[PDB]
Design a binder for this molecule. Structure first.
Ligand SMILES: [Zn+2]
Ligand SMILES: [Zn+2]
Ligand SMILES: [Zn+2]
Ligand SMILES: [Zn+2]
Ligand SMILES: [Zn+2]
Lengths: 150, 123
């Protein structure tokens, strides 16, 4: 079945929910790669959110200004990011990192129910819109190899 | 070149100036270029800038300089299109044809020439 989607949703969903609640979900997981990918995401996503916090905070404030479910507003933005024809791992980590930043805001305003749809909407953009690119790059295995030199 | 940061910084100031101009416009009209779409396009360009900064950072000791220039130029052309769309709306343009003509431009100069043509001949 759609294993690339299933795996991507698992990694993104775990990262977003643990960043929101501050707790690591003790649940077993393409096992080894998903652990290596969530780990790479924890290190990389941490740095992105800190370094570009002012840009992230500014973007979020422009979504709140229109009283609406922040996830619906964000999904509408993410679907225009690759419209220049360029795809890379940096843009991909940034989308997930911004999703994690938004997931924390959702946890602050007591809207953690809309976190699952957020991870799913991001996964829909990455997998169902960039499947051909992800497959050529070896999926999440190309993700871990790009961010870590050996 | 050292001027990659200045063009990127200039893009940020232009985006800020566009947001202020929209906020004022609403307070007392195209295809794919309404107030709603422009806000989303702006937010998307900002995510794209951060994304490419992270790409450059990890690519080293893991997008050539040519590709960076192309991507900056593409972002500038899109900003140039957004600005021309707001100007057309303020000058009375309501037909989607003119907004779509602008969106077909390849450079900021093409945008400028088209926008000048529409204001001079189709207002
Ligand atoms: Zn909010
Ligand atoms: Zn749209
Ligand atoms: Zn002007
Ligand atoms: Zn001129
Ligand atoms: Zn004409």
């Amino acid at each position: 079945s759609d294993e690339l989607y299933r795996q991507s949703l698992e990694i993104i969903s775990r990262y977003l929910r643990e960043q929101a609640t501050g707790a690591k979900d003790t649940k077993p997981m393409s096992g080894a790669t998903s652990r290596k990918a969530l780990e790479t995401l924890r290190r990389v996503g941490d740095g992105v959110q800190r370094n570009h916090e002012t840009a992230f905070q500014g973007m979020l404030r422009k979504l709140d200004i229109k009283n609406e479910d922040d996830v619906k507003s964000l999904s509408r933005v993410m679907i225009h990011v690759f419209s220049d024809g360029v795809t890379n791992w940096g843009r991909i980590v940034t989308l997930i990192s911004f999703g994690a930043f938004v997931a924390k805001h959702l946890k602050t305003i007591n809207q953690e129910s809309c976190i699952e749809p957020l991870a799913e909407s991001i996964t829909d953009v990455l997998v169902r819109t960039k499947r051909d690119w992800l497959v050529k790059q070896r999926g999440w295995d190309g993700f871990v190899e790009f961010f870590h030199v050996e | 070149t050292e001027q990659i940061q200045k063009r990127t910084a200039a893009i940020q100031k232009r985006i800020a100036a566009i947001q202020k101009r929209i906020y004022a416009m609403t307070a007392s009209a195209g295809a794919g270029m309404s107030i709603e779409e422009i806000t989303k396009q702006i937010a998307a360009i900002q995510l794209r800038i951060v994304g490419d900064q992270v790409q450059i950072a990890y690519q080293t000791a893991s997008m050539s300089t040519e590709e960076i220039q192309k991507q900056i130029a593409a972002i500038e052309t899109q900003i140039c299109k957004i600005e021309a769309a707001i100007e057309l709306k303020e000058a009375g343009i309501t037909s989607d044809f003119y907004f779509e003509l602008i969106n077909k431009a390849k450079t900021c100069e093409g945008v400028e020439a088209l926008k000048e043509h529409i204001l001079a001949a189709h207002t």
